[PDB]
Amino acid sequence: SMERIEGASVGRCAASPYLRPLTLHYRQNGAQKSWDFMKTHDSVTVLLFNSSRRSLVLVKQFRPAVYAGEVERRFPGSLAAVDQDGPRELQPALPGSAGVTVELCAGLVDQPGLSLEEVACKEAWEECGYHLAPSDLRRVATYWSGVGLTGSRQTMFYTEVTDAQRSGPGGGLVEEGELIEVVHLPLEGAQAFADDPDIPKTLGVIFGVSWFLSQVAPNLD
Amino acid sequence: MERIEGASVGRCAASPYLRPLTLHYRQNGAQKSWDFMKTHDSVTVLLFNSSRRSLVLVKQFRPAVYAGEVERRFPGSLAAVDQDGPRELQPALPGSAGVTVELCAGLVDQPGLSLEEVACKEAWEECGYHLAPSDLRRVATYWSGVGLTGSRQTMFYTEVTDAQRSGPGGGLVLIEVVHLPLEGAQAFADDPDIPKTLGVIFGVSWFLSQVAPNLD
Ligand SMILES: CN1CCC(n2nc(-c3cccc(Oc4ccccc4)c3)c3c(N)ncnc32)CC1
Ligand SMILES: CN1CCC(n2nc(-c3cccc(Oc4ccccc4)c3)c3c(N)ncnc32)CC1
Ligand SMILES: CN1CCC(n2nc(-c3cccc(Oc4ccccc4)c3)c3c(N)ncnc32)CC1
Ligand SMILES: [Mg+2]
């Protein structure tokens, strides 16, 4: 099950391909300053509107960082310094449902040679089972994600799909230990879904719903 | 604020803002692990000043954004330091590379203040507007950076007038307050030459579709 998590523990992270902390030293109007950040990849996200079903296509999956943040919210001190060899078991753990998010289809810009659009198409295939062409995609927005702690860009795309385009199993790469659920969000429930704070979601979902309902859906009515 | 000199990359062993951790867990019986950063939650505030019919935003130098732009222009600029000290960026970029436009915002890192009160504090110190917690509408709560941080961000909206602009703002001792007229708002958001956040883009889009049509 996606939401069945066991043995949850926190440990030190000495090196990682996904985050690499650095400090920028610089003078700003003659004052010497420093700033802590982490080097990270850019990313792409893609909102699909399935017109056969009149539903938006989203993904649901366990996010370990979200789970840890939620354990820390409900049990302050869970993420205390790991001053020991090896991980420290959480006491108490939360249910794994605490880390399950709803997101747009998304992936890192870590694919040598692929365009941003092609990365978006790859993720829509691998995560959702939808076959897209790059020219099917509309660029919605490009922006900085997390300006305080990283300098990564994210680019969001949009495309309309039909049922015939859902020709794959989706669910992410099985061999690589991914378990992703495809969510089809009926348009009639979409704004309520986004506004509901009991469903953990990203700003990309909330913005995607708002943007679609005000910029696209009227030109289909 | 855009006059940045002698930029250099050094190591970051400890920081009160990012602490690298690894979650270890079993899912479907398989042992997994995930690298992330422990970080603070945050709040953002969109203000509509109806005296001026303008959205209140902030502009400031963001070092991480700057570093990201140097790495884009000169790959390898951010390689591991491997020295006794920081390594100068040569070539570098002008400070304008790191200048962003954002919503008023702050970390939830201080005991004593609710989310609403952090937002009022930031609106005062950054924008010079005096707000009350009860003046705030919660627009959205969401997770930013679910891959590496898991921290939560709450966005508030509130309506102000010039009668509430009782301070200068600009931060504490370089933040500039931006007043975006409603008529140019959408064009501002769409302008890809303006370095801005998803919070700004969503704030302008939300305001123009949920508030602006019912004004007046
Ligand atoms: C709406 N429809 C949907 C699909 C239809 N379509 N699109 C492609 C097609 C082409 C080129 C790249 C592509 O996506 C990637 C391929 C590799 C890596 C990353 C993305 C997809 C295609 C095809 N090869 N054969 C038959 N039909 C096709 C036309 C419009
Ligand atoms: C004010 N004073 C002077 C500056 C000092 N400060 N603040 C940060 C820092 C951390 C994380 C987010 C961040 O901005 C956001 C805050 C909320 C929402 C979105 C972005 C800023 C920082 C750093 N990473 N490294 C060194 N100093 C740092 C903090 C105290
Ligand atoms: C097989 N896949 C599965 C995961 C595996 N992977 N991916 C990340 C990881 C990093 C940063 C962002 C992220 O997700 C987003 C990507 C785009 C937009 C929004 C979120 C994921 C990661 C980690 N931080 N620690 C350990 N393993 C990790 C390797 C590749
Ligand atoms: Mg993904």
Curated annotation (Swiss-Prot), chain A:
pH dependence: Optimum pH is 8.0-9.5.
Superkingdom, taxonomy of origin: Eukaryota
Record-level GO BP terms: nucleoside phosphate metabolic process; protein N-linked glycosylation via asparagine; ribose phosphate metabolic process
Database matches in PROSITE patterns: NUDIX
Keyword Disulfide bond part of the UniProt annotation: no
Gene Ontology molecular function, alphabetical: ADP-ribose diphosphatase activity; identical protein binding; metal ion binding; UDP-sugar diphosphatase activity
Membrane-spanning parts: none
GO-annotated cellular components: cytosol
Ranges spanned by the short sequence motif Nudix box, renumbered to the chain: 112-130
EC number(s) given by UniProt: 3.6.1.45
Major localization listed first in the record, in broad terms: cytoplasm
Obligatory cofactor(s): Mg(2+)
Reactions catalysed according to its record: UDP-sugar + H2O = UMP + alpha-D-aldose 1-phosphate
Keyword Magnesium (UniProt): yes
Quaternary structure and interacting proteins, as annotated: Homodimer.
Functional summary from the UniProt entry: Hydrolyzes UDP-glucose to glucose 1-phosphate and UMP and ADP-ribose to ribose 5-phosphate and AMP. The physiological substrate is probably UDP-glucose. Poor activity on other substrates such as ADP-glucose, CDP-glucose, GDP-glucose and GDP-mannose.
Family: Belongs to the Nudix hydrolase family.
Protein name as annotated: Uridine diphosphate glucose pyrophosphatase NUDT14
Natural source organism: Homo sapiens
Lineage of the organism: Eukaryota, Metazoa, Chordata, Craniata, Vertebrata
Gene behind the chain: NUDT14
